[PDB]
Paper text:
Here, we have linked one of the most common protein–protein interaction events, homodimerisation, to an essential trace metal, copper, through engineering green fluorescent protein. Using only canonical amino acids we engineered sfGFP so that its spectral properties change on homodimerisation in a copper-dependent manner. By incorporating a cysteine at residue 148 together with a mutation that stabilises the dimer interface, we engineered sfGFP to switch to a highly fluorescent “on” dimeric state. Structures of the monomeric and dimeric GFP-diS2 suggest that charge switching is through peptide bond flipping and the formation of a buried organised water network around the chromophore that spans the interface region.
In mGFP-diS2, H148C has a major impact on the local organisation of the structure that directly impacts the interactions with the CRO. The backbone of residues 147–149 is twisted compared to sfGFPWT resulting in a register shift of S147 and C148. The side chain orientation of E222 and thus its interaction with S205, a critical interaction involved in proton shuttling that promotes the CRO–O− form, is also altered in mGFP-diS2; as a result, the distance between E222 and S203 increased to 3.7 Å (from 3.0 Å in sfGFP).
Residue numbers in the entry:
A (entry chain A), B (entry chain A): 1 to 64, 68 to 233
Amino acid sequence: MRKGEELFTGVVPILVELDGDVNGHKFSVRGEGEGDATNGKLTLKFICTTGKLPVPWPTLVTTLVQCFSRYPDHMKRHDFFKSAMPEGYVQERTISFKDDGTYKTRAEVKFEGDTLVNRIELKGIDFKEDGNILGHKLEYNFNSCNVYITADKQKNGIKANFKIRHNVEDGSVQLADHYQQNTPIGDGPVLLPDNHYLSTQSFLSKDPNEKRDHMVLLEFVTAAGITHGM
Amino acid sequence: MRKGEELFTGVVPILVELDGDVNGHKFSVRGEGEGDATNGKLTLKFICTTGKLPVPWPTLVTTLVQCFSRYPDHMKRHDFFKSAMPEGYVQERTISFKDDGTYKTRAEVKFEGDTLVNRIELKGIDFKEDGNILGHKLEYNFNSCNVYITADKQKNGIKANFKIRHNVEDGSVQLADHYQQNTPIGDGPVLLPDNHYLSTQSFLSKDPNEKRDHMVLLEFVTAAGITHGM
């Protein structure tokens, strides 16, 4: 219906480009695949194009396109992410690993022709040489509870903070606290939502034929927490 | 693909019939609407046909069709609920309200012609006259974390136990512990899954034009927790 909305009615090609620096360990990640917003479905394959990924793949999942969330019909007015398209939005995080380092991400999510591009810069500091992150001690999997989206009245966008619990091999848990702010890139009307949340299921596999350090990622996202409308 | 699966590829009409007895308070509920398994989407309207519902609508949500879960393609072998169709399955629960009473449900979920029918008997006992349930002190809303499905090797079906946290008006929480066992009605092959879970978003509203005690229910369900396949 809305012009932003209209860009997402089919299957859309995704490109993700991440340049990272964690404690001076430089790397790049490239992802390719597609988003089906009607089904809230993401299929992507990520490659560490620089060799060995110096952090665990799961710590990068949230950083590596919430415009592909399935908003139920009655909640469509609360979908900031698609309203910002095609011009797109800046997404910034601080991710705080408990008793370990901090990631700071600046990404732009926008249309470049036919393709939805998530282009990221990641800077990690004060990582332990043999913590769960630099010492790769995290299980190859991922889950989250509800992620709460709130309006940023001030800067005309959205904010979110949420806790990711990563399984450690010794059977312990590594907390990664996410604070997120998103601002539109363009000056065109956007939708500022009421409080609601996104529910994400995540599936991380391996292509048995891929030799490069990679992640196969399948995701389902559904927005909830608002009944008004209906 | 599978013959059970094939019954759910479109929009299917649902009828739900509940006869209840809580502490001698007899009531019936009738629900009508549709399930779209491809989208994991349920739309139903429930009527208390006997007058005032003597328990809160949210305590009945889990009792009032997990065959409408969206199983991702790679997880289709782990979908017991549709394998049992058309003949269907018996679903039994004990729901234990913390410091209050207990529900016992026996339902049959099966095809009757074109329609998926959930026909239930509910028996509630040892309810407090002025607890959160008989004294209607629960907020008109509903959420759950993951519901874990496990095979019942013994009786050729599935089992689940899960905790529902109902919001109370004083700002407290009422726990309802669910133990679930499902057995196929027929003797035909069924699929016994590996451990996985269902994630449900729930939206409870009112038809502003309905005078009878009712619940409008919209639900999204997605199965996860298995990456093998893909």
